Design a protein around this motif. Sequence first.
Motif, PDB file in Angstrom:
ATOM      1  N   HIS A  44       0.822  -1.199   0.000  1.00 35.93           N
ATOM      2  CA  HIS A  44       0.000   0.000   0.000  1.00 35.93           C
ATOM      3  C   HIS A  44       0.866   1.264   0.000  1.00 35.93           C
ATOM      4  O   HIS A  44       0.596   2.187  -0.751  1.00 35.93           O
ATOM      5  CB  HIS A  44      -1.004   0.005   1.161  1.00 35.93           C
TER       6      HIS A  44
ATOM      7  N   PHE B 166       2.333   1.687  -3.601  1.00 38.26           N
ATOM      8  CA  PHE B 166       1.369   2.219  -4.574  1.00 38.26           C
ATOM      9  C   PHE B 166       1.145   3.689  -4.343  1.00 38.26           C
ATOM     10  O   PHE B 166       1.103   4.451  -5.296  1.00 38.26           O
ATOM     11  CB  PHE B 166       0.025   1.479  -4.536  1.00 38.26           C
ATOM     12  N   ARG B 167       1.025   4.071  -3.070  1.00 41.47           N
ATOM     13  CA  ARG B 167       0.832   5.461  -2.657  1.00 41.47           C
ATOM     14  C   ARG B 167       1.993   6.363  -3.056  1.00 41.47           C
ATOM     15  O   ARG B 167       1.782   7.489  -3.548  1.00 41.47           O
ATOM     16  CB  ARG B 167       0.659   5.544  -1.135  1.00 41.47           C
TER      17      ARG B 167
ATOM     18  N   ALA C 129       1.945   6.761  -6.763  1.00 47.06           N
ATOM     19  CA  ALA C 129       0.684   7.418  -7.111  1.00 47.06           C
ATOM     20  C   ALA C 129       0.745   8.944  -6.862  1.00 47.06           C
ATOM     21  O   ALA C 129       0.420   9.741  -7.750  1.00 47.06           O
ATOM     22  CB  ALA C 129      -0.460   6.800  -6.315  1.00 47.06           C
ATOM     23  N   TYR C 130       1.188   9.334  -5.666  1.00 43.06           N
ATOM     24  CA  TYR C 130       0.979  10.703  -5.175  1.00 43.06           C
ATOM     25  C   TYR C 130       2.221  11.510  -4.864  1.00 43.06           C
ATOM     26  O   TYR C 130       2.177  12.746  -4.880  1.00 43.06           O
ATOM     27  CB  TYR C 130       0.075  10.689  -3.934  1.00 43.06           C
TER      28      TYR C 130
ATOM     29  N   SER D  37      -3.974   2.558  -5.124  1.00 41.41           N
ATOM     30  CA  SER D  37      -3.994   3.289  -3.849  1.00 41.41           C
ATOM     31  C   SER D  37      -5.416   3.544  -3.352  1.00 41.41           C
ATOM     32  O   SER D  37      -5.710   3.334  -2.173  1.00 41.41           O
ATOM     33  CB  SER D  37      -3.234   4.620  -3.968  1.00 41.41           C
TER      34      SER D  37
ATOM     35  N   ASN E 198      -7.403   2.048  -0.009  1.00 42.40           N
ATOM     36  CA  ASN E 198      -7.796   3.118   0.903  1.00 42.40           C
ATOM     37  C   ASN E 198      -9.314   3.220   1.006  1.00 42.40           C
ATOM     38  O   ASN E 198      -9.831   3.982   1.819  1.00 42.40           O
ATOM     39  CB  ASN E 198      -7.204   4.464   0.439  1.00 42.40           C
TER      40      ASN E 198
END
Length: 323
Positions: A234, A237-238, A241-242, A304, A308
């Motif tokens: 997680h 991916f986060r 992703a961000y 993500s 979430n």
Amino acid sequence: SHKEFTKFCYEVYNEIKISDKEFKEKRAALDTLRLCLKRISPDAELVAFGSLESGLALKNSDMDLCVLMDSRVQSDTIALQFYEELIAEGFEGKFLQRARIPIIKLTSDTKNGFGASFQCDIGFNNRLAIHNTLLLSSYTKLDARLKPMVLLVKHWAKRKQINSPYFGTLSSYGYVLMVLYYLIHVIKPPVFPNLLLSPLKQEKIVDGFDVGFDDKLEDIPPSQNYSSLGSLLHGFFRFYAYKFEPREKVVTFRRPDGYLTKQEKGWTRYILAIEDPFEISHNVGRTVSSSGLYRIRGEFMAASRLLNSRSYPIPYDSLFEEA
């Protein structure tokens, strides 16, 4: 928590990882290929690298091999002789040469029993790929979470159609580096130290590049990161992703803080920039197009958001559904 996601991850991992059976068949194929080489050049060694050697192999794995020989002997002559032996022995494939670099690509076995779509690439003195693999093998030994994490990321990228270096996305090796970069330089506390930057690291120059790293693994303290596999994934991916900034930054194993701009490198394709840890002039992300990067980032974001999600039950299966 990630308790349920972690349980799901290990379930998928056990279904997608290479079986003991297939692994032993790949070992048997390597043995027969070595016999063919022996008949041609007794001095040459045939060695495996890549996924099968590092233990990061999915089911139906391809094989990557390198012929090692005296560098004063011209590789095209032995390559062709090796190729002609392999054909005589019932393998099918192509002999080719890109610039100075000869390559044999095998695509079938019609006699030796390793399958009608047996796939094996053979290089000649590709020493760097051997060293790349040694590094990945060492990390795989250092922490038992790496292997399932990598296989799951590879399976994800395949399912989302973002694992196609010929069609504007990223190689599996690229994804492995993205995972390692995250685990070394992003997550706190780190899962791994940077072995290239160790004060114990001894320079070793191979084909003009420093392939040195601290490989005395027994003296390395275990990680102080206690995250479950689900949590590691997680965070991974986060981050991409961000947080990661693909327009400005380079995925790198050569800075103590993991910080490197495309500008310093002169890597202004450089749409996605991943500096190969040894061959630092090589951008592993050079296959990635604008549209390809868009989808990669989009999939990182969707992964993500899924993990979430507060809509229970979370459909974890959709993580590996075809895009």
